[model samples]
Structures are given as C-alpha cells and as structure tokens.
Target: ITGTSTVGVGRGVLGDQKNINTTYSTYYYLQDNTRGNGIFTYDAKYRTTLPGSLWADADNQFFASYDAPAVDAHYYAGVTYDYYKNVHNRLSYDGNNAAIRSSVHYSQGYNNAFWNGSQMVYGDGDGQTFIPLSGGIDVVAHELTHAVTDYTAGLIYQNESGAINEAISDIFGTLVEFYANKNPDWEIGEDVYTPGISGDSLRSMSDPAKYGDPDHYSKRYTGTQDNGGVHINSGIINKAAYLISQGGTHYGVSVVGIGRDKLGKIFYRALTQYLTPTSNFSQLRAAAVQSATDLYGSTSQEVASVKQAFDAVGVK
Candidate 1:
C-alpha cells in the first residue's frame, strides 16, 4: 500500500501559451518507520498552466488568474509566518521550520476557498458577480488561520467552539492584513468581489453594524444565515477583538487602546497559551485579561483597556 505521495512541479507549452504544471507522481520511498516491505504507486497530477493562465478561467481574465493568487498567497503567507516568528518566536506553522504549500485555481467557478489538512486551496470566482477568492491577503490568511486553530485548541467546530473557530480566523486574518498595511480600512473579503455590489465584504471588522446588521450578540442571533450562524455570529467575537485591540466603549464603559501590536500579542498569548477547545466567552475573557496582566502588569493600562473592551462587547 502507498503511504506517501509527492507532487512534481513542471511547466509545458500549449501552442503559443505557456503552462506551468505541478504533477503529483507517486513512487516508492524509504520509510523511516520499519513495518513491512511493500511498494505501491500513488495518484498525483501536475498543476500546469501558462504563467499568466495558471489561475485564469476560460475567459483569460488576468487579475483573477495565477498572478493575483500567487501574489496574495505569497504575501499573506509571508506576513503570517513573520507574525508568528517575530511575535511568538515560532519557527513556522508547526514551529519545526515546515515549508508551507499554497495552491491557486483549486476548482473552476469555486466561490469560496479554504485550507485543507496541509495546503491552501483557492477558487476562481463566478466572474459575473464574484471575483477570485485569492484576491485578498486577509482572506488568504483567514483560511491559513483555520489550520492554526486546528493545530491548537482543536475547537469542536460546533456551538461556541464553532464560533471561536471562526472568530480566531477573522482575528488573525485581520491582524495579518494590518501587519501588511494593505489598506488602512479593516474589511474582510473586500477584494474577493467587484465594487458593483452594494455590500462588498463578507464581514467588516472595523464596524460590523455598517452592513445594517447588529454588532452586539444575543441568543436570537444564531437563527439567521451562515452555517448555523458560524459566520454571522462570529461578528460578536470579531467586534469584541476589535474593541479590545482598538480601544472603545461597549455598553457604556470606556475601552482604551494600548496599540494594535500590543493588543494582538495579548490575544495571541491568551488563545494559544490559556484557552482550550471548549472555551467559552467568559473563559476567553478571563484568558485575555490574564494574558494582558501577565505581559504588561496587573494594573497596566493594557489590562484595563482589554477589560473595558471586553465589557463593551458584552463579554462579561
């Protein structure tokens, strides 16, 4: 039986156009773990397209083609990698210097993108209404962050766990975008769709209510759209994070900002160091406050600001 597969990278020419291909070819390789002697052939394909057409659809659109996907993937991956490395001193995603693999043009007319077990997959948009999913750096980072969550808390993917999973992705995704300094405004999925749409984003971190939606969380909020309301209800946590990081008021308390970097650090530390898979709003709140206190001080302005922000978002 085949235990491992390897994808080969290659390029071929089709008439006047060039195609760069990644072929997954399988062959027998030495297994470090001694079990039994066997040889097997695995299935693999090379992803090939013209350097320009790699991510292009039949229409030969260039922006949504391989160029934008490649650029966004590389840029976002670099930013996330650096954030983990410099801020947390982690070597890479696994802290083992693991090489990150990103793939564009996962499927034709795929409206959404996500991270599989090991690599990132993107889709070409319908073109009529949506742009390519690979257009935004923060969006790319958001998927990668799902992988990060999987590796960490391993959130159960339902109920509060599901909400936490989505929230974490949005949080880090926006942070990566902010670190990249792409756009001063904090919006998600802004690049994945054309400007013709009235609502250009899937979510807005700076102001969730701008979409004519409520920013505060309530029990009734989960009955609406978005996969058991995973995406919809995530606005609550996203707003909480934003409030804490940026410093603002929630129900009436004054939340303060100690700076974006400091706020991100506090949250990162709390999520990775303190929270568990089953963590809830109160637990998360305690973890963040504790993280801030430990990093800054018990009476530090950062801790105070975090508490105030959490309260502002009804996290208390």
Candidate 2:
C-alpha cells in the first residue's frame, strides 16, 4: 500500500523487542521502504495460499502473540538484506535492489520455510518440531541466501550441485549470523529448531557427522531421496568450509585456519564469478581454490588452506 514510511515497535517470536519499518495509510502495514526497494511481509492466516494479506495493524505496535512471526520475518529480512549490501557489496539478492517479500503463518502445523523462486515463506510449526521459523536469523538468512544463489550461480538443486547449493546457503547463513553477532555459532537453526530441546540444531557446520551427516566425501549419501541427498550430502562441503575458516583435522587431514573473513571472501567470489548451474563437488573445490588464488594470490596461505580444506574433506 502507498503510505508514508513509519517505524513500528514489535516483539519477535523469541519475545525480543525491536523496531520494524511500517507504512501508514489508515493501518500500519508491514511494508518497509528503507532497505533497497522495500521489504514487505504478509500474513498467510494458516492457509496454503501465498503472500496472503499484507500485515496491517491498527496501531504501529505489534505485540500480539500472532504477530511474532511477522515481526521476525520482516525484521530478519532487513537484516539479511543489510548483510549482503554491507558485507558482500551486493545491492540485494539480484544485485539491483529487488524488493524482498515474505509470508508468515503459511499453514496449520506446517513446520518448514522456503524461497518459492519469488518470495520467502515461513510456516508456523507444530510447536514440537519448531515454532515460527522466522524467529531464527540463520534460518531466515539461509532462505534468503537461496534467492542470492538463484540470481547468481543458478546451481541446479539436485545431486552434487544441489549439495553445493545447500552448503552455500548454510555457509552464508552462518556468516550472517556472525555478522548479526547475536549468540553466533557454527550450528544452524539452533534458536528455533526445537523449542523443547536445548543446545541442539538442525545441522552443525563444525561437526556435521554429529547429526549423522557425512563430513567426508567417501561418506556422502548416494540415495535418491531429498533431491539426491542435497541436505544430507551438504555436510561434506559444510565441513570443508568450516575447516577453511576454523582449521581442524579430519580423518588425518589438517587445514590451517584462514578465519571467517577470507573464507567468506573466497566463497562469495566463487559463487558470484566461477560457479555455474552444474558445478559439482570437484568443480566447487576448483572454484574455491581459484577464488582464493584470485583474492589472496596463488602462493598465499588462503589458497593453500582452501586446498587443504577440500583435501581434508576428500573432495580432491
């Protein structure tokens, strides 16, 4: 809706108070005009229909229990946008300041979130497996990163390429989490994965095998499920990325920690420049090595660490 930009106060799913951008015509609508083109959030009303009604409040205060998801979705989308613009120097997911949009409360008992090739969608979980997914910054960033990947690498979401795609999201998701500096960790979705479980997450970048995911190429899942185990096999790449940043020994292979800044620089360069739709695990290794060499020189330790990390993950 066309209206003057305004600021609204809200509490997220985690009960954290924050300010959100809104639009004021008659009702305060969740359409922020500050970042990029804009960031619009909608209410799904527990239905399957997409991008349902634009969230509007009589007052510019969102504190109702039902408003939690919308608050988080809108706020986190802005945070993700800022991360790309500030950290990667990318305007938006499209590098042209494309308007970011999202819908919360997608369906009853729906326990998932995704980028539908157009906008982001979050489900209100069954209260057992998850709560409102938008509450998790890493989860929100992960989904938004898919949009970034769609506009850049265009990596096909299957087989080895799919695994690389998933890992890229995880890598940037973690990076964004660190960028936000809100109890950052290498684990994914620890905040909203299981409200009942403590110290557990959807996946672990530092130790993928702890969640039964393969940390080595030889242990990768070859099954046809999950789009050729995209989520399952991503562990291999995720572990390599972790090793590249943190430096650790895996299966007699040791990598020197190159820190997160260089790790992000190398991967971001590879994703935006060298990777393609069909790039596989080996190709990803080549891209990372070349990207590191491009940014830090062929003889630099960053390049060597990239090689060592992939070698540690058996991706040679």
Candidate with top TM-score is 2
lDDT of 2 by residue, 208-305 (tens): 99999999999999999999999999999999999999998889988999999989999999999999999999999999999999888999999999
lDDT for each residue of candidate 1 in 135-195, tens digit (9 for 90 to 100)? 6777777887887777777776766667778888888888887777767446788766664
Query: Cα deviation in Å at residue 26, candidate 2?
Result: 0.7
Local distance difference test scores for all models: 0.62, 0.95
Q: How many steric overlaps are in each model, in order?
A: 15, 0
Question: After superposition, which runs of candidate 1 have C-alpha atoms over 4 Å from their true positions?
Answer: 1-66, 212-214, 224-227
Error of 2 at 19 (Å): 0.6
The 10-residue segment with the lowest total lDDT in model 2: 288-297
